């Protein structure tokens, strides 16, 4: 009579199936169909019905339930396929044994650069593991983008957006794997936690997908510090992209370095900038000319001459060996500072805090000083006093 | 009368005003220090050609967001691309509508 | 919508070294709407309005100057014609009579003509050049003149008959009565152009002077003079102002050179013409309505008037949108109104907005409205039979689409070549981006924030959209563009249509074309039976089955949905239920021995009659389940006896079919086609037996005399 309602809770009080799934079908409500599949005992044709009914619905988590259930894995694999569901089809194809499913995505991924998506290609490659991939092509796009009126914040944003998209997928797996969890998951997870414990600069440096954000983020704030006096700040911010120099090339460091040491008198910055200009890869013979005519005039009207400034202790070691405010090197002492993505300062007291999305450590004199109500490189909204006393909370865990 | 007051309250700036402070640097800069530059015979013109105007750069603490930030850059990539304009135009929609 | 040019004529005597130009002032239109009028220097030029020629010669030498205005009486039997001669002429207008044309009345004042205007009531001349103002009255054939300070500009009558109101070039306005008496004056600093009274209306029933002023803004007042401080600012100049009938639309002309229309509030709505020159006088065709007329009335005709010498006609047509979904149908009314209807009871309920609705999509209990740059949400309380309508939510960003879907928690909105995903607060979500314009799209049920959809564009490629896939999937490819789509029940085939009338039948486990037919408007799939299509031709409905001949009804409409037992029919913009027989099916189905296909169909709402035949089918073609189902459908009691006797016989006995024929045929009044089929095979002795019980022994001892009894 078309009831389906009806009908369906009548199925249920007398424990039929196949009728309770023809009208949850009809109602359109595959909560109950989860019921059933959750309560069909084993390996029955009703199984690959409801897979079918599932894929067709486009829910390929509960299709390939029901496919595992039924005891059939390929059609589990062509309904992932089909549906481009590809963190899924890889989970199953590493637990299954499957090899066509990296060079289908390999091809999938050539179908869409061909169609001008490259944005489409780095999200693929990022379902599947694939950062150095999507990294390669962020670089590329952010070449290209040199070559228009390139505004550094947009830049910045593209890069700030892979780091969090990295960070949300990341992020989704793991509550997915901690939820629900048993011993040997346990103890794994503590062999993970005692390897953290004692990890290695390189290995976080690799992991860290925030490298191209914070090195735009310096050029940024440094251009920005320079035009706005506080030449003293800007040294330190053109030091750390000298510190980075994966991202941006040589000649923006070099060029944003020499200008900064100009304007402060610091000039064995200066001359190491321009020692290092004077041929990076490849230069034509005039621009290298009137490079080296703009050194010797620079370092003909007066000899370098060294600034002081204050020597304040090391911090990083129990050397009593002090070393220069600018300095981040820390030579022969191999404890490198981290920065301070509020001013560029290097950590240099115990006062540092990060918030829980770029974990930056953060001086909170200078919070105090600019009233940064926000992160200055992700933008956390969260108030900053309370993040400085849930890192003392955490340093006192220490 | 409630709606403008809301409206002017968020205001989210989408596409029109996200950073629309445009002016002129190349003059403006060199009023603030390059004197000291010109006195001297230093000649550093050609190595400020890597720096970018600064009153483009805007400098203030908002609020960024995941899903509007995801909209601007791929709003970005596509004008820059200009693969959306080509095949509209080849689309000759006036002509059908 | 459309805006279509019907007749244009030129004036290019343009005559150097002499005050007469080529130029148009004004165009007098009629009531009724059959004729034309219009002024050009030293001519009166008439036209008619459906096709563009002169059914008078131009008239020369009446007057010696220029002519300023031209205006009708309402009754289409009257002229005024006021000139730079200092003086006005009023003429005798009827079609039927051989002078169509004629003077009737001249007067003079002491200065320039400037403004004319007449009396809806009392058919009263009310003429205002410089330095005096004069007033005429057919009966008495004594005017009225009187002395003013400065050149009245422009005049305009009450609609009641009993107010008028004029402007002048030093900004002052003044409203008097009929005794020409100070009952309002208002200064201000801007010279005043056009005015007009607002219609009267059983909604509103208040008359208000509106009045467009030189400093960019337009305003309303009142009676007693005091502004309704609405002062709504103009990006141009307004020139000529002029109200539709009863008050609905409003069509602004002046600097910019557009003719653009208007609401009585001020929303805008489209822009008639550009004509790359100042408009000067733009009229609107008044319409008469019967008592009780039915009638969509969506033509609309203006009449332009431009500097250079051009009288163009244009006509605006307004499309159909609306939206079905289901027991609801919401389709748009005249415009800025939205109305649903239920095909059972044909009852409407009207909701009223104030700008232009441009998209109506419907979901399950919940309405969307696309007001510009704004989105309204209405629920409804299913408890309750009628339906109550709440604002939920209420959306203030601004999305351009010429079509927009609402799905739960997320809408869709189509918008050149990309299609963008919103959420109810208004943040925009997701993207997709495909070659051409996304023409037609279909959505289809699902989980919330899981719905899919399919989607055409204009290469013809049909693909499949998921909401957190943010991939397409493509389905099929199409040479053709694609109009409209069309999903099966279960989702096993698809109807497409192209550009030219073409329907294409595409099945989804096999991409193979099974159907093709020619020049067909629309098509629809039923919803229970997931088989039968109806589609719809321009005169023509076909309803096809599988593999089934196709059923002609010469119905006049086209097919817009298909349920159990109903079809519907739209005709302009109402709506219609028709119901459909279904015994041609069962009796093919019958033919072939499908027997559950055939009480399938039989199941849709079918005469008792087809029920009882069906279920003698099933019992003599030893089908037990669905004969008990036939005969329990309908209260019978001897049919479902005969039928247990005929299952508890059928294991043991040898269950020949003659006898339980011959009894099925028996249990009705016909016999002798019983006695027959029991004659046929071999029953003589059980037909006897059987006829003996209804006591007419004769014709029992008839059928003996031929039967035998072999026993021993
Ligand atoms: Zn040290
Ligand atoms: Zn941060």
């Known amino acids: 009579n078309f009831q389906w309602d009806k009908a369906a809770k009548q199925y249920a009080l007398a424990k039929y199936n196949p009728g309770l799934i023809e009208a949850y079908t009809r109602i359109q409500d595959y909560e109950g169909l989860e019921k059933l599949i959750a309560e069909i005992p084993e390996r029955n044709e009703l199984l690959q019905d409801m897979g079918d009914r599932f894929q067709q619905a486009g829910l390929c988590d509960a299709a390939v339930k029901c496919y595992e259930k039924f005891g059939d894995i390929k059609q589990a694999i062509d309904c992932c396929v089909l549906l481009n569901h590809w963190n899924l089809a890889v989970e199953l194809a590493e637990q299954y044994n499957f090899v066509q499913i990296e060079g289908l995505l390999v091809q999938y991924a050539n179908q869409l650069l061909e169609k001008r998506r490259k944005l489409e290609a780095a999200e693929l490659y990022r379902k599947a593991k694939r950062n150095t991939e999507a990294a390669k092509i962020l670089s590329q796009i952010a070449d290209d983008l040199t070559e228009r009126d390139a505004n550094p914040l947009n830049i910045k944003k593209m890069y700030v957006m892979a780091a969090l998209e990295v960070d949300l997928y990341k992020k989704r797996m793991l509550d997915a794997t901690m939820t629900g969890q048993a011993t040997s998951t346990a103890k794994t997870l503590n062999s993970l936690i005692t390897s953290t414990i004692n990890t290695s600069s390189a290995d976080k440096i690799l992991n860290n997908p925030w490298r191209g954000a914070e090195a735009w983020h310096f050029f940024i704030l440094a251009q920005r510090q320079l035009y706005n006096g506080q030449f003293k700040y800007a040294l330190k911010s053109a030091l750390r992209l000298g510190e980075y120099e994966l991202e941006i090339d040589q000649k923006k460091i070099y060029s944003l370095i020499a200008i900064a040491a100009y304007y402060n008198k610091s000039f064995r910055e200066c001359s190491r900038a321009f020692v290092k200009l004077q041929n990076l890869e490849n230069i034509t013979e005039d621009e290298k000319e009137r490079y080296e005519a703009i050194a010797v005039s620079i370092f003909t009207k007066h000899p370098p001459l060294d600034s002081p400034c204050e020597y304040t202790p090391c911090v990083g070691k129990n050397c009593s060996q002090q070393v220069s405010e600018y300095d981040i090197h820390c030579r022969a002492c191999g404890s490198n500072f981290s920065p301070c993505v509020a001013s560029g300062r290097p950590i240099f007291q115990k006062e540092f805090y990060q918030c829980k999305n770029c974990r930056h450590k953060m001086i909170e004199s200078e919070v105090s000083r600019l009233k940064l109500y926000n992160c200055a490189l992700c933008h956390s909204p969260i108030d900053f006093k309370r993040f400085t006393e849930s890192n003392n909370n955490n340093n006192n865990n220490i | 009368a409630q709606e403008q007051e809301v409206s002017k309250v968020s205001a989210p700036p989408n596409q029109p005003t996200v950073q629309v402070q445009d002016i002129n640097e190349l003059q403006k800069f060199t009023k603030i220090n390059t004197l000291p530059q010109t006195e001297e015979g230093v000649d550093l013109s050609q190595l400020m050609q890597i720096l970018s105007p600064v009153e483009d750069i805007k400098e203030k603490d908002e609020a960024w967001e995941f899903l509007q930030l995801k909209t601007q850059i791929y709003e970005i990539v596509s004008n820059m691309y200009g693969g959306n304009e080509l095949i509209d135009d080849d689309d000759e929609d006036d002509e059908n509508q | ?712």
């Open chain 3, 1 to 712: 919508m459309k805006c279509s040019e019907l007749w244009t004529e030129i004036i290019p005597k343009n005559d150097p070294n002499s005050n007469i130009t080529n130029q148009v002032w004004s165009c007098s239109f009629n009531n009724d709407g059959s004729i034309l009028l219009a002024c050009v220097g030293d001519a009166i030029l008439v036209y008619d309005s459906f096709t563009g020629n002169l059914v008078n010669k131009a008239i020369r030498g009446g007057q010696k100057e220029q002519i300023n205005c031209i205006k009708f009486s309402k009754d289409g039997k009257r002229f005024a014609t006021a000139s730079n001669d200092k003086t006005v002429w009023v003429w005798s207008f009827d079609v039927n009579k051989n002078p169509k044309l004629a003077p009737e009345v001249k007067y003079s004042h002491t200065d320039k003509v400037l403004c004319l205007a007449f009396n809806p009531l009392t058919h009263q001349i009310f003429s205002g050049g410089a330095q005096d103002y004069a007033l005429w009255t057919p009966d008495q054939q004594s005017i009225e003149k009187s002395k003013f300070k400065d050149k009245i500009i422009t005049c305009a009558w009450s609609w009641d008959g009993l107010y008028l109101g004029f402007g002048t070039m030093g900004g002052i306005i003044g409203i008097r009565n009929r005794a020409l008496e100070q009952l309002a004056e208002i200064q201000r600093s801007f010279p005043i152009w056009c005015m007009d009274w607002t219609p009267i209306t059983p909604d509103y029933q208040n008359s208000v002077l509106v009045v467009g002023v030189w400093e960019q803004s337009i305003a309303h007042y009142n009676i007693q003079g005091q502004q309704l401080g609405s002062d709504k600012k103009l990006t141009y100049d307004p020139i000529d102002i002029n109200f539709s009938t009863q008050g609905e639309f409003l069509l602004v002309s002046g600097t910019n050179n557009k003719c653009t229309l208007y609401t009585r509030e001020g929303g805008f709505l489209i822009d008639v013409a550009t004509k790359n020159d100042w408009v000067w006088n733009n009229k609107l065709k008044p319409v008469i309505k019967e008592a009780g007329s039915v009638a969509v009335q969506d033509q609309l005709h203006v009449a332009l008037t431009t500097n250079d010498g051009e009288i163009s006609m244009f006509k605006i047509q307004q499309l159909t949108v609306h939206a079905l979904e289901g027991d609801k149908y919401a389709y748009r009314d005249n415009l800025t109104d939205i109305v649903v209807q239920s095909m059972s009871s044909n009852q409407r309920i009207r909701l009223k907005c104030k700008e232009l609705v441009k998209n109506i999509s419907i979901y399950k209990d919940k309405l969307a409205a696309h007001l510009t740059e704004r989105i309204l949400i209405y629920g409804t309380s299913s408890e309750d039979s009628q339906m109550k309508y709440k604002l939920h939510k209420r959306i203030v960003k601004k999305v351009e689409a010429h079509i927009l879907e609402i799905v739960s928690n997320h809408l869709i909105a189509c918008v050149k070549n990309k299609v963008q995903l919103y959420q109810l607060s208004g943040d925009l979500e997701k993207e997709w981006v495909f070659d051409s314009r996304v023409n037609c799209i279909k959505i289809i049920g699902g989980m919330p924030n899981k719905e899919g959809a399919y989607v055409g564009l204009k290469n013809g490629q049909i693909f499949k959209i998921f909401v957190d896939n943010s991939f397409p999937i493509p389905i099929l490819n199409h040479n053709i563009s694609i109009k409209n789509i069309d999903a099966s029940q279960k989702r096993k085939r698809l109807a497409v249509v192209d550009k030219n009338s073409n329907l294409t039948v595409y099945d989804l486990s096999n991409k193979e074309q099974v159907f093709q037919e020619m020049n067909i408007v629309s098509c629809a799939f039923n919803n229970n039976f997931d088989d039968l299509l109806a589609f719809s031709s321009t005169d023509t409905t076909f309803i096809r089955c599988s593999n089934h001949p196709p059923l002609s009804q010469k119905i006049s409409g086209q097919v817009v949905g298909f349920k159990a037992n109903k079809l519907f029919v739209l005709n302009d913009n109402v709506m219609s239920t028709i119901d459909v027989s279904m015994t041609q099916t069962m009796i093919k189905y019958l033919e072939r021995k499908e027997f559950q296909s055939a009480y399938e169909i039989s199941l849709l709402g079918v005469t008792d009659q087809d029920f009882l035949y069906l279920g003698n089918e099933a019992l003599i073609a030893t089908q037990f389940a669905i004969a008990r189902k036939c005969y329990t459908r309908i209260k019978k009691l001897d049919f479902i006896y005969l039928l247990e006797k005929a299952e508890k016989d059928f294991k043991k006995n040898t269950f020949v079919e003659g006898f339980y024929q011959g009894e099925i045929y028996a249990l009705q009044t016909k016999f002798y086609e019983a006695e027959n089929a029991l004659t046929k095979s071999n029953l003589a002795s059980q037909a006897k037996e059987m006829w003996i019980i209804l006591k007419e022994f004769d014709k029992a001892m008839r059928i003996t005399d031929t039967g035998a009894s072999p026993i021993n």
